[PDB]
Amino acid sequence: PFFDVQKKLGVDLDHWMTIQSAEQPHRIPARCHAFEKEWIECAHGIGSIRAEKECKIEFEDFRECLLRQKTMKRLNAIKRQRDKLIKEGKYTPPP
Amino acid sequence: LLQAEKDRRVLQMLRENLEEEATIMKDVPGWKVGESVFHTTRWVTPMMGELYGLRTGEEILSSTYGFIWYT
Amino acid sequence: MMTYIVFILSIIFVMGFVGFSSKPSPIYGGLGLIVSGGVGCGIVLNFGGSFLGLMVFLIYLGGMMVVFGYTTAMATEQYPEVWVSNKVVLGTFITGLLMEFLMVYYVLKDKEVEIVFKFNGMGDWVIYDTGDSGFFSEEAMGIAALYSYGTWLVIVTGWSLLIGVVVIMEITRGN
Amino acid sequence: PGIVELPSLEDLKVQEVKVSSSVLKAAAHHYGAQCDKPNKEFMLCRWEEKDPRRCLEEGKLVNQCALEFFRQIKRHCAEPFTEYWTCIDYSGLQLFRRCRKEQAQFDKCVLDKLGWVRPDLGELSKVTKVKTDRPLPENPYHSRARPEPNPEVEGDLKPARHGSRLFFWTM
Amino acid sequence: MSLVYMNIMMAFTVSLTGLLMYRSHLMSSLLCLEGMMLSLFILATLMILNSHFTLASMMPIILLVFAACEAALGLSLLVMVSNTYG
Amino acid sequence: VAAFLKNVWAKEPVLVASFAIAGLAVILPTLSPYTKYSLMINRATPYNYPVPLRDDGNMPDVPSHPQDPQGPSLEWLKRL
Amino acid sequence: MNPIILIIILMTVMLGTIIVMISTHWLLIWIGFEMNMLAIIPIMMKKHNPRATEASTKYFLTQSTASMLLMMAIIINLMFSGQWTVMKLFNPMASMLMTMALAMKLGMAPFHFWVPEVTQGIPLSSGLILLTWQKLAPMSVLYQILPSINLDLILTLSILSITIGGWGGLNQTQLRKIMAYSSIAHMGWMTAVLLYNPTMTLLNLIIYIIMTSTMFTLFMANSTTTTLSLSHTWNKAPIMTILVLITLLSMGGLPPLSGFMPKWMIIQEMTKNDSIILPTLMAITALLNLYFYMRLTYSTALTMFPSTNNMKMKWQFPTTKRMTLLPTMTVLSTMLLPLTPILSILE
Amino acid sequence: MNLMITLLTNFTLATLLVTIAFWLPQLNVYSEKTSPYECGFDPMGSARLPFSMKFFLVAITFLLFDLEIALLLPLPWASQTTNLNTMLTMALLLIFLLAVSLAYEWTQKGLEWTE
Amino acid sequence: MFMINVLTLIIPILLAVAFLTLVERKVLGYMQFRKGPNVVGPYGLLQPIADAIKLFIKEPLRPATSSISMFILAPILALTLALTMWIPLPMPYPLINMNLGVLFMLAMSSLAVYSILWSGWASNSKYALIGALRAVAQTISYEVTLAIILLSVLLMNGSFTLSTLIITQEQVWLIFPAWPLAMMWFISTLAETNRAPFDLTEGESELVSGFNVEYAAGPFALFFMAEYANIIMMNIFTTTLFLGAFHNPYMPELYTINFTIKSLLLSITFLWIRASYPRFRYDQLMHLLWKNFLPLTLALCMWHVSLPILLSSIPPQT
Numbered sequence A: 001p002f003f004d005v006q007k008k009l010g011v012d013l014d015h016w017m018t019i020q021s022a023e024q025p026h027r028i029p030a031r032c033h034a035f036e037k038e039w040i041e042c043a044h045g046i047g048s049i050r051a052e053k054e055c056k057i058e059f060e061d062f063r064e065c066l067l068r069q070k071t072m073k074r075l076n077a078i079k080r081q082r083d084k085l086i087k088e089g090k091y092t093p094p095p
Numbered sequence B: 001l002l003q004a005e006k007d008r009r010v011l012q013m014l015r016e017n018l019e020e021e022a023t024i025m026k027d028v029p030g031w032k033v034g035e036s037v038f039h040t041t042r043w044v045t046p047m048m049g050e051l052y053g054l055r056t057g058e059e060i061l062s063s064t065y066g067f068i069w070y071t
Numbered sequence C: 001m002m003t004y005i006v007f008i009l010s011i012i013f014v015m016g017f018v019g020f021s022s023k024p025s026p027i028y029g030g031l032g033l034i035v036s037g038g039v040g041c042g043i044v045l046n047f048g049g050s051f052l053g054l055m056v057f058l059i060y061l062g063g064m065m066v067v068f069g070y071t072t073a074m075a076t077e078q079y080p081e082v083w084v085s086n087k088v089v090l091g092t093f094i095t096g097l098l099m100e101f102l103m104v105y106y107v108l109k110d111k112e113v114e115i116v117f118k119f120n121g122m123g124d125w126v127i128y129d130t131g132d133s134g135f136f137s138e139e140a141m142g143i144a145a146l147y148s149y150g151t152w153l154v155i156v157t158g159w160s161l162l163i164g165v166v167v168i169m170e171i172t173r174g175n
Numbered sequence D: 001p002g003i004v005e006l007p008s009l010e011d012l013k014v015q016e017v018k019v020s021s022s023v024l025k026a027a028a029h030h031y032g033a034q035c036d037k038p039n040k041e042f043m044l045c046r047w048e049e050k051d052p053r054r055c056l057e058e059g060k061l062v063n064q065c066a067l068e069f070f071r072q073i074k075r076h077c078a079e080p081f082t083e084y085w086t087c088i089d090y091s092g093l094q095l096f097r098r099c100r101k102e103q104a105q106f107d108k109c110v111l112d113k114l115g116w117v118r119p120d121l122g123e124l125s126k127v128t129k130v131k132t133d134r135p136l137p138e139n140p141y142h143s144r145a146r147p148e149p150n151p152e153v154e155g156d157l158k159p160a161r162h163g164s165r166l167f168f169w170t171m
Numbered sequence E: 001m002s003l004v005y006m007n008i009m010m011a012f013t014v015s016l017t018g019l020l021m022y023r024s025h026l027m028s029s030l031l032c033l034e035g036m037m038l039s040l041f042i043l044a045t046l047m048i049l050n051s052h053f054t055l056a057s058m059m060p061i062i063l064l065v066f067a068a069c070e071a072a073l074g075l076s077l078l079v080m081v082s083n084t085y086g
Numbered sequence F: 001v002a003a004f005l006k007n008v009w010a011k012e013p014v015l016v017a018s019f020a021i022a023g024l025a026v027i028l029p030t031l032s033p034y035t036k037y038s039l040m041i042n043r044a045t046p047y048n049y050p051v052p053l054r055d056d057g058n059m060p061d062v063p064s065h066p067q068d069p070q071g072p073s074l075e076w077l078k079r080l
Numbered sequence G: 001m002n003p004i005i006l007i008i009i010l011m012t013v014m015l016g017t018i019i020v021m022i023s024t025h026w027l028l029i030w031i032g033f034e035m036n037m038l039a040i041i042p043i044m045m046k047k048h049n050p051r052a053t054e055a056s057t058k059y060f061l062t063q064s065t066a067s068m069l070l071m072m073a074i075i076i077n078l079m080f081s082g083q084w085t086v087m088k089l090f091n092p093m094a095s096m097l098m099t100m101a102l103a104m105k106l107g108m109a110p111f112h113f114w115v116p117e118v119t120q121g122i123p124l125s126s127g128l129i130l131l132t133w134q135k136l137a138p139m140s141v142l143y144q145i146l147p148s149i150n151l152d153l154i155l156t157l158s159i160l161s162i163t164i165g166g167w168g169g170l171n172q173t174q175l176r177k178i179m180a181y182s183s184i185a186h187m188g189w190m191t192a193v194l195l196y197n198p199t200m201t202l203l204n205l206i207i208y209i210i211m212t213s214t215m216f217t218l219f220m221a222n223s224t225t226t227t228l229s230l231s232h233t234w235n236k237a238p239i240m241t242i243l244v245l246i247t248l249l250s251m252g253g254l255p256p257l258s259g260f261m262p263k264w265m266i267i268q269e270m271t272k273n274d275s276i277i278l279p280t281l282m283a284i285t286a287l288l289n290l291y292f293y294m295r296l297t298y299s300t301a302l303t304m305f306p307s308t309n310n311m312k313m314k315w316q317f318p319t320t321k322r323m324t325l326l327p328t329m330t331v332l333s334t335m336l337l338p339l340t341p342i343l344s345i346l347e
Numbered sequence H: 001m002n003l004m005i006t007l008l009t010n011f012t013l014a015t016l017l018v019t020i021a022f023w024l025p026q027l028n029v030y031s032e033k034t035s036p037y038e039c040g041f042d043p044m045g046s047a048r049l050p051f052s053m054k055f056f057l058v059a060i061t062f063l064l065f066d067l068e069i070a071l072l073l074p075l076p077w078a079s080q081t082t083n084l085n086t087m088l089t090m091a092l093l094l095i096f097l098l099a100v101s102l103a104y105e106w107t108q109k110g111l112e113w114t115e
Numbered sequence I: 001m002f003m004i005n006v007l008t009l010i011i012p013i014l015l016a017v018a019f020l021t022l023v024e025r026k027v028l029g030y031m032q033f034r035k036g037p038n039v040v041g042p043y044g045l046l047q048p049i050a051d052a053i054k055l056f057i058k059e060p061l062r063p064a065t066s067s068i069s070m071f072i073l074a075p076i077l078a079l080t081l082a083l084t085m086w087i088p089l090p091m092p093y094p095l096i097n098m099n100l101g102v103l104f105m106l107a108m109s110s111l112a113v114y115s116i117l118w119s120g121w122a123s124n125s126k127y128a129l130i131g132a133l134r135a136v137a138q139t140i141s142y143e144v145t146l147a148i149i150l151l152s153v154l155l156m157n158g159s160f161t162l163s164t165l166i167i168t169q170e171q172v173w174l175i176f177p178a179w180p181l182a183m184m185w186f187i188s189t190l191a192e193t194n195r196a197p198f199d200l201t202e203g204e205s206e207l208v209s210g211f212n213v214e215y216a217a218g219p220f221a222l223f224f225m226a227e228y229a230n231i232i233m234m235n236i237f238t239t240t241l242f243l244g245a246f247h248n249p250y251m252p253e254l255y256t257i258n259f260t261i262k263s264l265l266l267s268i269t270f271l272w273i274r275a276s277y278p279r280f281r282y283d284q285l286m287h288l289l290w291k292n293f294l295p296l297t298l299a300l301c302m303w304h305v306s307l308p309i310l311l312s313s314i315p316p317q318t
């Protein structure tokens, strides 16, 4: 039976370390901060039942910040063509 | 000053990435032109993987692992 | 100019436990751990974890493993201290985790993962820090926030420790 | 899904400030004194709208200010500044408690000739107020649609009807 | 999830299977548990310090403190068990 | 009290002096006049770039030019 | 032991569980578990016999490693899109490891191996404090994290708890063991319903706490570790025994007695949803536990046939052994079925 | 990497010096081997051992007091923040708590060392 | 270039160990009213080379070890730690400048005891075991206290850098702001090394150094090495922590000279203390630490947590 005292007595206990967007010691933005801001802006007043449904797009945006599965896979897709074109010369621009 | 200089440097670098990518990836299996991967288009910081890559690998050593173990 | 050294240290770290966890005696247990843990300093440090790495290099290495090896050394006395047994499945899991670990570092092309645990993703490149913050550790300042913001948290910790004392001695029979 | 657009390479390639951190440090102290009409403004720019590649023009502006600053120190007080940044460049964290003689010496050439009272410990903080003609960005970054929140419970409610309603047990 | 995460998880499960599938020595059990615990320290550290989420950096510390005052308890119960027989 | 403290300070001076350093260390931070100074110092050191705001349509203070005095002044630290 | 220190420990156990209930952060809840272990090791072992030492160890290993597995799941939550809160886990896997972890914390089917053993090792009062109080924290967590629970697991662990754990205890003449296996069965129920309507889970939780409460308290009244002890007390004084048996039938869920109420409501809110077959598959095993317990009810009669009832053991002096609240909980676990419109007071 | 080179060297010279120290004595001019070494009977030095709780408890209290020490270790970073009141309160509180553990164990039969 | 730096660091600490042993024998000699070694070379400067190559050449001498692993582990560890401890010590310049620093030295100093656990473990002699366990006990108990002292005296630096220490020392030696904690930390530095009074011994006694100092021959020239080198260290780290000189850049060798002189004199005071006083019995030692040092360290510590905020000077973390 999860009880909420800390909202009742009006005291913060664990709310400070809870999510990335909280006020930092000397405010330094977290890597994915802004997308926390939009995921909580989307899912704030709703019940996590339909937040699943309707906040999906922006949530997946947040995930793609955190884990970086898709973009990492993209860079990989770049070296995978680069590789087989070491054979067929594309030369290099850089010095 | 350091801020303006820096951000110009990184934008230059990312565009160079864009043109190289454009030359290499011409072929049938088009992902078309260089795109963000997010469902919402707005500025988001580079990964430092995106910036430094294909770079000869010398300065990814000192840039990525450089600061740790000092100079 | 390898610069996979985070991944090499990760691998040796695994190897410590893999070949480690078998054989009957802890006397080599201490060795296996302290090796793997020091390598853990390797990992954490190579992400720039400097203080935290030094704390697993102080508390856990010194305090934990010293107290372990102290009790083990006191509780058990080893005349023979031989090569013993049971290492067979440890080496065979160094082969199954050698082509399984080489399977996750092989199939790592694009994204690699497993069908048992959660997903993973893979590939050769690594993501790290930029956006310098002047005169910040980004860590130790965090722990300064332990003392500033960690009110409730240091309360429950400390209390759980002092209870640590009365429990331990209570079980060692002061009466 | 969305395709990013980045400015033309020639949109970049504006100017140059090439100096060591050492000279740039103390010279920075003085221009941060007299300059900062453009660059604070720049900071509410890229700070307010934040999209580097959006405001870079004003980066051209600040780079202009600093550039002509160093130009004036070139043609105006040259030698004393040179000895000053070369004594501050013996480094070891470049401490300003180290070479003072040419701090007072440098501000002595400057003041004796070009002015520039030194701001000292009051140069900064005191969060600055600045005007900009550009209208503030609204709905910054993504700024999507709202959740369509759920209706809250309202109205006077009376006792329930006939009780627990269970397999039996009326009231 | 990079690679290092995969590998550290495999270490975790090596320690866990080593926990369940060997009852012979008790110190070995307790140990394997503790090594696993170390692996958790490493995970939380690498993650938190990867995302530059600073205010939460305690999780290595306060996760590590109970790696001990609980472990110490473990060894005390080990001694009080050994002096039953041997 | 007097005899008790004389006797515990006759037997175990290390422990008495330890409690003295302790207690005095507890109370003295409350009384001493210099306390607030430390706080105001510690707050006077910026780690993070002061970031400007839209000026027009505001109440005038903390003015644009860094010399214009209307903002806070740590001069009290300049001479102290 | 000191009569203060026990207060300064039990106070910390109460405190720990209160923290597991109150905190909205994971790392805290993990700490609350750590404190309930650290402080609950001294309660067990109170008397220094070796049984309590080996048993307290078997509690300590599986309980502590359970805690660690919990931490692993928490961290995997941090990996996948993550923050530190108490709410639906965003990983299916993290939810898996966490349902296993909270399946060790409290006795469940693959993980129940320790409960009978430790329950017979440690003394009576530690037996009470083990099978009730520490059982409040994990349910208080599951009630929170239920939205991400994979249904197939907790449904499985519930059934296998009822089948295995319930089917057990047959040859057992010991008491503490019987109370253990019954704990695992009521577990199988409370966790069975958990996904559908958790209100009923807290219900069977509370009723269950009253049940084991009067049970163990009676075992303190008549100090009995075996059924033979029960019969010998029947020829010492009757009343405490028939309280033990009637509360055992209430532990079997026999229709007029109050133990039938959680079974009955669980069958409603279980079968108004689609599946009717699984409840019957539970009710069978429930009958099994029953006529076992009613074997323990042919443990007694009058005009008895020979039990070898001995002597010396009439006594002229009543016992002063202090029974804290026996009567209120006795009548409260016998007579409660004519209540429950009151069910909804709980949630 | 630099300090890692220092560790590679400093581990070498250790290894090298050890090796030299093993070679030269059994590389010596004449090495002769006869005498029996009796592991044998229990009373040579000491006998057996009934390992005693005191030392072990010293290891334990070394743990708990470590934990409190390292939990205290970051303080020099924390001594400067914008909340001084709370700082003093919980630093004095924390190490005061350490001293409470010590005071308790010093009140009970623990330590006292002649037994 | 860099390996040149390493060699110039680690070779002179070894030579420093040898000629240190010389100065030891002499100072104890005259302190005892008798001339030290004159008859090996002039004035005694050939004595170490004697001790060195002889003590290397005496043959390995006993017994079956029962562990080939640990026996050749422990010496390597003891050295490697003793050599790498010298890295951060500031000098005019550190040779590795670490942000944390001093707690890194604290940490490795905490690791240094495995050589005692393992060394005393592989004896196969059940008595040298017990002796080793006890020596571990006292070393560890003074790893408790010392840590708290550094965690206090440092709190006037404001950061761990170990460089900024030389910045704090400019106006006044850190001995003045706290003398007593510096006193307790000096005696603490006597602790681990087990210099007299704290040493164990021959004759009748626990004889930890009986088989520890006996056994492993050349590798005893190693444990010998790490012990004395570690001594020179703790003297130097005292010289840096609780006092120091003014660093005049453009001429660092000035500070290097003054630093060197004070450190050497301090070690001289070690060797003559060892001459001076008897030994404590063991329990009286261990619970002498637990009785008195640690409580007063707690008091002084909390007084250094509360003090800097009083006087409003709290140090400037860079």
Ligand SMILES: CCCCCCCCCCCCCCCCCC(=O)OC[C@H](COP(=O)(O)OCCN)OC(=O)CCCCCCCCCCCCCCCCC
Pocket (backbone or CB within 6 Å): B067, B068, B069, B070, C031, C034, C035, C037, C038, C039, C041, C042, C043, C045, C046, C050, C051, C053, C054, C057, H001, H003, H004, H007, I077, I080, I081, I097, I098, I099, I100, I101, I104, I111
């Ligand atoms: C069978 C046994 C086999 C093994 C035997 C081993 C024998 C020797 C064991 C003792 C020696 C342990 C040495 C540990 C070194 C730790 C270094 C460290 O923590 O350095 C801190 C420093 C922090 O840098 P900082 O100042 O914050 O920043 C610089 C500017 N930004 O950090 C840095 O600057 C970054 C440095 C990162 C370099 C990688 C570190 C890898 C460590 C691997 C340890 C392997 C051995 C483990 C210990 C075994 C103990 C028995």
